[PDB]
Amino acid sequence: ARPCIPKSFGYSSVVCVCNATYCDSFDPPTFPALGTFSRYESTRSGRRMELSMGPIQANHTGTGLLLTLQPEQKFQKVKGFGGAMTDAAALNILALSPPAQNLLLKSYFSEEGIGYNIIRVPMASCDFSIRTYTYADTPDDFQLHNFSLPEEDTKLKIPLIHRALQLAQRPVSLLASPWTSPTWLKTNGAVNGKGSLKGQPGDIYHQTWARYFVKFLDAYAEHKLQFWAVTAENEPSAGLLSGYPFQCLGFTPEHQRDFIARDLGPTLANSTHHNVRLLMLDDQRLLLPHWAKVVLTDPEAAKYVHGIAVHWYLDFLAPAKATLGETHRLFPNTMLFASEACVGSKFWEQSVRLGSWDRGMQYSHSIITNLLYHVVGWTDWNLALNPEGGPNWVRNFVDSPIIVDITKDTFYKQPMFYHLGHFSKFIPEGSQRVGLVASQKNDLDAVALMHPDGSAVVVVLNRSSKDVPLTIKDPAVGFLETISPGYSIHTYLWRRQ
Ligand SMILES: *[C@@H]1O[C@H](CO)[C@@H](O[C@@H]2O[C@H](CO)[C@@H](O[C@@H]3O[C@H](CO[C@H]4O[C@H](CO)[C@@H](O)[C@H](O)[C@@H]4O)[C@@H](O)[C@H](O)[C@@H]3O)[C@H](O)[C@H]2NC(C)=O)[C@H](O)[C@H]1NC(C)=O
Ligand SMILES: *[C@@H]1O[C@H](CO)[C@@H](O)[C@H](O)[C@H]1NC(C)=O
Ligand SMILES: *[C@H]1[C@H]([NH3+])[C@H](CO)[C@@H](O)[C@H](O)[C@H]1O
Ligand code: NA
């Protein structure tokens, strides 16, 4: 293993500095012996997923905080964790020297790094692009004879996705989402602004747009890439808004319902891509449960919908119980999945705050809350950005867990990288959330899961300044005596047999 090289930029914590010859990494992962636990600790004071071990003891006395594992009490199974391969992320990554590129990709995708198993792939251009394009810009090509992948896919995204899959030990799931259709399919004839597909579901415009998904998956399959899932549209609500500044395509929930039922569902179902999952919504969770009721109460739409994708941007309006909780109660067999998050998109937020602990805590707080309300996965936005938070053709700059400094052939791993890795690295696909009961009221955020192999994982986040001693009881194994430092995040792992 190789430790964090810390650097301060005057914010609350440090970044870890990597370059062509050096990056912080782990040793090969294992469980310690039965009766021992592993702790990984990150702190605002500068610890970065530091590994320690302790004994699991037969007995416990005290009136301190006890968190009792409920291994019998089972909730959702995890799909996974990852980020987005936008044009901006791909340009930032490929601007590094080849050896620095490989250290960045290992940081995300390998067991020497944090074990990402999800990549979100935009279907052509979005705001995190430098060129505005679709795959079918030749007008009135309803046949899609002129559908093609440009160099943004064939030279940048696709080769990087192959290199990520080559570095991974866990199967990586690709997720595709479109921002805009070709402008000749749209009411407003522009990639942006208020506008929907022309006509109505079941017509030539909607059939063409559904066939465009199949053409996309056909083109990526020619490059030996297969998708786990697509979303029905990135942020369909955005295309309902006057002047929306970048690539969008407006659907009401009724329009999405009818488009899925008539066009996208049947077109995917009758293609070689029939196993590819379809996720609906791909938008702010305040739209639940209303969007889920509109789409999923129509059985002809419901039969094609695997899952509901959510974005975090208005989570402050949208209590998890009233949205995620209510949606799970009404549609328990339709998985909830978090498909886009980043800090820096509010007009008052600075784009990039190198070393921000607050932004790290925003990530881990969101992931825990999502996991506590049945969500099966969590997906970052841009995998890498430049120090301005770009490039972005409408200057909608944001933050990213990795910031590339091409003049120094350097990249910085921010607190958000480690906060996400406290989950991604230690919660493999198939992990099942289990109960975790507190003996008393407390300021911690915590979640417990069981690996498919039966081992235990617990993540504890302390967003307070105060150290909290605590005990974790696993009824079948014993007690972990520990302490959650102020402004810390821990992951605990142990064999149960
Ligand atoms: C890529 O990043 C690498 C990590 O920063 C760069 O390597 C570093 O280069 C600097 C400047 O030559 C070295 O700094 C000197 O450090 C020694 C202390 O050395 C040792 O102790 C440190 C821990 O404090 C440990 O990390 C090392 O392994 C050594 O045992 C001081 O005495 C000097 O005054 C001066 O500060 C770093 O030691 C060196 N680190 C490593 C791990 O090699 C590398 O140059 C960068 N590459 C490019 C192409 O830019
Ligand atoms: C579109 O595809 C057709 C059929 O292969 C081709 O002959 C035509 O020139 C293409 N059009 C453009 C404008 O690229
Ligand atoms: C999600 C989100 N609004 C971010 C940041 O604003 C944007 O860059 C993506 O296009 C969007 O889908
Ligand atoms: Na901003």
Numbering used by the authors: 1 to 497
Which sentences from the paper describe this structure?
Therefore, to probe whether this holds true from a mechanistic inhibition point of view, a crystal structure rhGBA in complex with cyclophellitol aziridine 2 was obtained at 1.70 Å resolution to enable a detailed comparison with cyclophellitol epoxide 1. The electron density of the resulting co‐crystal structure unambiguously shows that 2 reacts with the enzymatic nucleophile of GBA (Glu340) through the aziridine warhead to form a covalent trans‐diaxial ring opened complex which is essentially identical to reacted cyclophellitol epoxide 1. Indeed, 2 forms a covalent complex in the 4C1 chair conformation with a covalent bond length of 1.46 Å to Glu340. The only notable difference between the complex of 2 and 1 lies in their hydrogen bonding networks, where a hydrogen bond is formed between the O6‐hydroxyl of 2 and Asn396, and the hydrogen bond to Tyr313 is lost, likely due to the “downwards” displacement of Tyr313 in complex with 2. The flexibility of Tyr313 has been reported previously and the “downwards” conformation observed in complex with 2 appears to preclude hydrogen bonding with the ring‐opened aziridine. Instead, the aziridine warhead forms a hydrogen bond to a nearby water molecule in the active site. Overall, this co‐crystal structure demonstrates the almost identical binding mode of cyclophellitol epoxides and aziridines, which supports their interchangeable use in the development of ABPs for GBA.
